[PDB]
Scaffold this active site. Structure first.
Site, PDB file in Angstrom:
ATOM      1  N   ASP B  92       0.833  -1.196   0.000  1.00  0.00           N
ATOM      2  CA  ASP B  92       0.000   0.000   0.000  1.00  0.00           C
ATOM      3  C   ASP B  92       0.876   1.258   0.000  1.00  0.00           C
ATOM      4  OD1 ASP B  92       0.776   0.283   2.652  1.00  0.00           O
ATOM      5  OD2 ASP B  92      -1.091  -0.553   3.432  1.00  0.00           O
ATOM      6  N   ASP B 270      -7.896  -7.553   0.261  1.00  0.00           N
ATOM      7  CA  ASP B 270      -7.028  -7.764   1.404  1.00  0.00           C
ATOM      8  C   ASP B 270      -7.805  -7.303   2.620  1.00  0.00           C
ATOM      9  OD1 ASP B 270      -6.376  -4.650   0.834  1.00  0.00           O
ATOM     10  OD2 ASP B 270      -5.887  -5.137   2.905  1.00  0.00           O
ATOM     11  N   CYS B 308     -13.318 -27.860   6.416  1.00  0.00           N
ATOM     12  CA  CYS B 308     -12.055 -27.202   6.119  1.00  0.00           C
ATOM     13  C   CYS B 308     -10.914 -28.196   5.951  1.00  0.00           C
ATOM     14  CB  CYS B 308     -11.727 -26.222   7.244  1.00  0.00           C
ATOM     15  SG  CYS B 308     -10.185 -25.333   7.013  1.00  0.00           S
ATOM     16  N   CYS B 310      -7.705 -27.455   6.063  1.00  0.00           N
ATOM     17  CA  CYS B 310      -6.440 -26.959   6.606  1.00  0.00           C
ATOM     18  C   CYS B 310      -5.813 -27.900   7.639  1.00  0.00           C
ATOM     19  CB  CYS B 310      -6.588 -25.535   7.160  1.00  0.00           C
ATOM     20  SG  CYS B 310      -7.006 -25.395   8.916  1.00  0.00           S
ATOM     21  N   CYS B 313      -7.435 -27.995  11.154  1.00  0.00           N
ATOM     22  CA  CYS B 313      -8.666 -28.760  11.271  1.00  0.00           C
ATOM     23  C   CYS B 313      -8.439 -30.258  11.128  1.00  0.00           C
ATOM     24  CB  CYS B 313      -9.709 -28.242  10.282  1.00  0.00           C
ATOM     25  SG  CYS B 313     -10.272 -26.567  10.713  1.00  0.00           S
ATOM     26  N   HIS B 339      -5.801 -21.337  10.244  1.00  0.00           N
ATOM     27  CA  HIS B 339      -7.124 -21.765   9.836  1.00  0.00           C
ATOM     28  C   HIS B 339      -7.878 -20.649   9.105  1.00  0.00           C
ATOM     29  CE1 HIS B 339     -11.256 -23.072   9.680  1.00  0.00           C
ATOM     30  NE2 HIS B 339     -11.548 -21.919  10.262  1.00  0.00           N
TER      31      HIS B 339
HETATM   32 ZN   LIG Z   1      -9.293 -25.189   9.145  1.00  0.00          ZN
END
Ligand SMILES: [Zn+2]
Ligand SMILES: [Zn+2]
EC number: 2.4.2.29
Lengths: 373, 373
Positions: B92, B270, B308, B310, B313, B339
């Site tokens: 930015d 963002d 999820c 990830c 998880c 996560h």
């Molecule tokens: Zn997750």
């Protein structure tokens, strides 16, 4: 694997190297145990802890019983499952932190009642309750519950607390043995007391050996006596313990303390130093510790240590870590902690290899010459 | 790869999916950019950021110029090298945080002087200095330096700040173009202003298109107007921008804001929300956000989200993360952040796939029905 089997593969003087086999894994000795306070080794995933070389971690019973609670952890499947570390865990008894952190402590021959430092809720510990909490956590190496002796201590006070500790060691033994699942799957270590007094240390060793434990800690040191005195006490104390079981020096510590303690027959160590001091900016190097916050590192592109094999030293500069720590960034704590624990594990590996190869005396000398240059 | 090439692979209504190719990598659009404030995406190693699916991250110029300093970063090899992220970085301009965080600001047609919020040291930003700082950092996507318009704003004030922003956009363009290495290797985005006023938004779009940029942000939104108004402004504002360049909505945001903005032709986003709110206990799930600190999660063995993919998880429970966050443990922030950023990337992937497959309208409806059930 068996419940517990300690085998010594090589010796040099009083130093030993070998393995402890347990159901959840093998522990190479001499061993350094990273400290997991409240079910986490601070700023590290368990996989990262393992990647540094750790075979076993320590859990703090006092902290865990307060938050999230021992019964809760048991309901959730035990500490290993809760935090995601599937290898051995040694738990302390909770007694020391009761003394150091809690308030309104009422001590008796039965145990101790105390108020939580977090919310003033009332709690109790005793040999029986400590062993039970360690069971609820699913600890692999359980520590007997003892009564600590401050430094300095009068001979009378040191004797009284040692004697109580030995009575409590027998109570801990019986509590552990009376719980089938615990007795068959975990190990129990006793703690030698007696302050700096040879006769008391001998009486304590005799009492513990008579009861019989899987391992023996030297308690009551690294509490203000200084290294010379600690080493003096180790000189006579460690030979009093059964030779064929692991010897654990609690609450230590600095790399030089570890090397000298191994020279005196110690097999296991834990300390918050690499984790705690890492978050505060202290990084270990083979040329001695540095404080990464110091302005001299602001534009230093070298890694924390020139030889270290850790992932941090492969990827990031002193300058970057200096910035992170000064900025209070979480990644700073992550990187410092990973490096420091990796450094400690590399130290232990060099110790094990040198004892195995019959050159540990030379290693200790070379290590000191450079570390304190 | 080229300096910059945006290709649209598929469309559905105003929504688009495609790629931006740059020297340091390809960016899949619509894209979510994790925010790196002071040269770190909070609580994550760059490899973890990448593992979640991020193609590009954002760096905050205001923060970086204060600590560790732009010239220092350049001396150390640039931001990518410093922090260990080798893919594209968008920076930015620094202007917004000057307004929001700094003190003693003196504004003029030349730029702004201000005191650091950290130590009261004096600093300057201008179109030329902002572009230079972004060069020193080694930014891949450079943002033009503008003058922000508060909400609410009078038509006169909105016009004045928009007009100044357009003069500053031309100055930014010329500064960027006059620096060979920057012009040949980085991209420059302009920022549309005009508050909630259609005529001002049109004038701004016209001015920016006349100057010519590699991409166009919609500035001046998500500053208190609320979603209905933001969407109303996007409805007329995005079609004013060149269709064949990326459209970037700054400062947003919530999953529903992202979905609706994509429906209106936005390609890039963002926000600190997944990182910041993660550290504060908010976890995103397909059934809406939860606050992991809530007592209802204390013994919940399910992962943060049931679907999820990830690593968090796959391995840890709500109960464990609840404990970590309530205890103030660093690992809590690490796991929550990983996560949440992974969730955002999975959202973007579902958006890209659904547009590619001509079923984004259905996806948006299904997403909302479940998220707000
Ligand atoms: Zn997750
Ligand atoms: Zn290292």
């Amino acid at each position: 694997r068996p419940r517990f089997s300690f085998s010594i593969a090589a010796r040099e003087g009083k130093a030993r190297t070998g393995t402890i086999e347990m159901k959840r894994g093998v522990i190479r000795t001499p061993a350094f145990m990273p400290v997991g306070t409240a079910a986490t080794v601070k700023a590290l995933k368990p996989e990262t802890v393992r990647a540094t070389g750790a075979d076993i971690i320590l859990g703090n019973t006092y902290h865990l019983m307060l938050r999230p609670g021992a019964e809760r952890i048991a309901k959730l499947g035990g500490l290993h499952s809760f935090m995601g570390w599937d290898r051995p865990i040694l738990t302390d008894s909770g007694g020391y932190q009761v003394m150091s952190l809690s308030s309104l402590t009422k001590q008796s021959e039965e145990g101790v009642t105390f108020k939580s430092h977090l919310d003033g809720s009332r709690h109790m510990l005793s040999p029986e309750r400590s062993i039970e909490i360690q069971h609820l956590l699913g600890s692999d190496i359980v520590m007997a519950f003892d009564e600590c002796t401050p430094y300095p201590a009068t001979p009378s006070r040191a004797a009284s607390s040692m004697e109580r500790s030995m009575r409590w060691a027998k109570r801990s033994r019986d509590a552990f043995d009376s719980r089938k699942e615990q007795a068959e799957n975990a190990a129990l270590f006793g703690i030698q007391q007696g302050s700096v007094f040879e006769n008391l240390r001998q009486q304590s060793a005799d009492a513990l050996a008579e009861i019989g434990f899987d391992g023996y800690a030297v308690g009551g040191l690294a509490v203000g006596e200084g290294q010379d005195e600690m080493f003096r006490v180790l000189d006579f104390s460690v030979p009093m313990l059964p030779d064929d079981k692991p010897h654990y020096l609690m609450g230590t510590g600095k790399p030089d303390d570890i090397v000298g303690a191994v020279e005196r027959g110690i097999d296991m160590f834990d300390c918050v130093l690499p984790t705690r001091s890492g978050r505060n900016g202290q990084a270990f190097t083979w040329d001695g510790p540095i404080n990464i916050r110091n302005a001299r590192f602001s534009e230093d592109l070298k890694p924390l240590d020139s030889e270290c094999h850790c992932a941090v030293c492969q990827k990031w500069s002193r300058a970057y870590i200096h910035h992170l720590i000064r900025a209070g960034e979480i990644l700073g704590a992550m990187l410092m902690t990973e490096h420091n624990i990796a450094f400690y594990q590399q130290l232990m590996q060099k110790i094990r290899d040198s004892i195995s190869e019959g050159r540990f005396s030379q290693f200790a000398q070379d290590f000191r010459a450079r570390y304190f240059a």
